[PDB]
């Protein structure tokens, strides 16, 4: 049950029912295009000039302008139908934006998980390597010219920080492995034992071999985590979640404005329709057509408030499409999404107690209307039923009396 | 006010259904009685 | 609040006393916001005493 | 509800009362933002602005408040039984002291 007028509660034709939001990547350009496809419809309404509104949303008609009320009613009905369709599209825009936001959250969640795993692996390798380096350095008797004195790993890029860079550390580890493999081959020479001031001993080779084996065992496990971290950090940089939140806010404001636009058009259509009509009954000391005319002053303020909100909602997107303060210090952060979500939810909660003021008046007038229309059928229905019942009762009684006369004449014979 | 409206918007339907059933049963009984009277008429007229 | 939100565009939102049923619920908040203030003022001393 | 003289320790009373007093900190503060942040669930990561989700969240908050009220109901009987026991013990004590 769903129409411009309905008695079935929440409706999907307006954007009030529940809808799932799987993580599906809808590009921000798609959001911008879909939102601008509707924002062009509201330029005349947001301007506020009545002449522009009547020129844009109302059709002039045949070259010879017909001033009869029927053409005016038809034009208003067409405008109302167009507004209804625009509202139907703005409904689906919301779900599109929500799915985009969900995907944008999932990607950088996975990216930061992978980064943490890779950093932990690097920290473990750093913990494991250094003691063997010290042990091998302690067991050296050469002059230190070709077989140099080793230095502690990660001398520049401090890995123990929470969010440091991690490529220079890997390159330093690779360079250390290369240096170890280079210095290992000179241990196989024949004239390395030059003199007492520089020579080799028995325990240098086992230490060097153990260090090389540990490095080779660590790198083999380090590699896949580095690859996954790089791949996932590159992917999460191709989507921002803040602009999608802004688009969601803008589309919600657009739907809110389209609601009152449709309400105004429907009110005008119904007011024009009830001209000199049989259904224009009188209630509460006034005519039914009179009740509709009183709705405009409140709508002209509620729509003003909605347009004031939508103007800021529109201006926010244009100035913050691709610029700093929308992307932040690192690839994954929820300290900014949470605050904006909180503010948006608070604004959504607050606005549900404002539109209801005019919603209840519209519901009151509409309720008067369908109550009168539906009550002006039950008398006729019951009258027809009672007439049929009485006719059937009389017919049955008459035929029974005829049957009694029949048996009378039969057994009297 | 709420539960008064909600509960009052069922008795009309209940009474309408009851009255329709009562009228249908009354008509059915009257028709079958008239048929029985025609039956005895045709039987003893034979 | 739950019942006010529930009656949005509903079939059961009948009109009585020159107002809609959903309108009647909205008028309860100003009195509750003072009664709860009084109860909280009592509860603050009740908590501080212990 | 009856209140037999049963000894419930004052530490039990303090713990049972603080288990409810934590629920009212946001309400007793009076800030609407804190109230909506504490007693209302935000929901799915993609904030649904439809009225149905708002209705569901308000219903959940109402149910939570109902359960809290149900527990605060039994706290009263616990405290009353504790008071009755505390009166009985020193009544007997002073009777014995007078006799001696």
Numbering used by the authors:
A (entry chain E): 33 to 445
B (entry chain F): 400 to 445
C (entry chain F): 300 to 349
D (entry chain F): 51 to 150
Quote what the paper states about this structure:
Corynebacteria belong to the bacterial family Mycobacteriaceae, which is characterized by a highly unusual cell envelope with an outer membrane consisting of mycolic acids, called mycomembrane. The C. glutamicum MM is further coated with an S-layer made of the PS2 protein, which adds another level of complexity to this unusual cell envelope that is incompletely understood at the ultrastructural and molecular levels. Our structure shows that the S-layer of C. glutamicum is composed of a hexagonal array of the PS2 protein, which interacts directly with the mycomembrane via an anchoring segment containing a coiled-coil motif. PS2 is an SLP composed entirely of α-helices, an unusual feature among prokaryotic S-layers.
The resulting data was used to obtain a cryo-EM reconstruction at 3.1 Å global resolution, which allowed us to build an atomic model of the C. glutamicum PS2 S-layer. Amino acid residues 33–445 could be reliably modeled into the cryo-EM map, which was sufficient to visualize the S-layer lattice contacts. The missing N-terminal residues of PS2 (residues 1–32) are predicted to form a signal peptide for Sec-dependent secretion and are presumably cleaved off and not present in the mature SLP that forms the S-layer lattice. At the other end of the PS2 protein sequence, the missing C-terminal residues (446–498) were previously shown to be important for cell envelope anchoring and are also predicted by bioinformatic analyses to form an anchoring segment on cells. Due to detergent (SDS) treatment during S-layer purification, this anchoring segment was likely detached from the MM and remained too flexible to be resolved in our cryo-EM analysis. The PS2 monomers assemble into tight hexamers within the lattice, which in turn are linked to each other through prominent trimeric interfaces that are repeated throughout the lattice. The hexameric linkages are primarily established by residues 90–110 and 300–445, located around the center of the hexamer and in the coiled-coil MM-anchoring segment. Each hexameric unit is connected to neighboring hexamers through trimeric interfaces, mainly involving residues 194–204 and 213–235. Both the trimeric and hexameric interfaces are formed by a combination of hydrophilic and hydrophobic interactions, including salt bridges and π-stacking of aromatic side chains. The combination of hexameric and trimeric interfaces results in varying pores sizes of 6, 27, and 81 Å within the lattice.
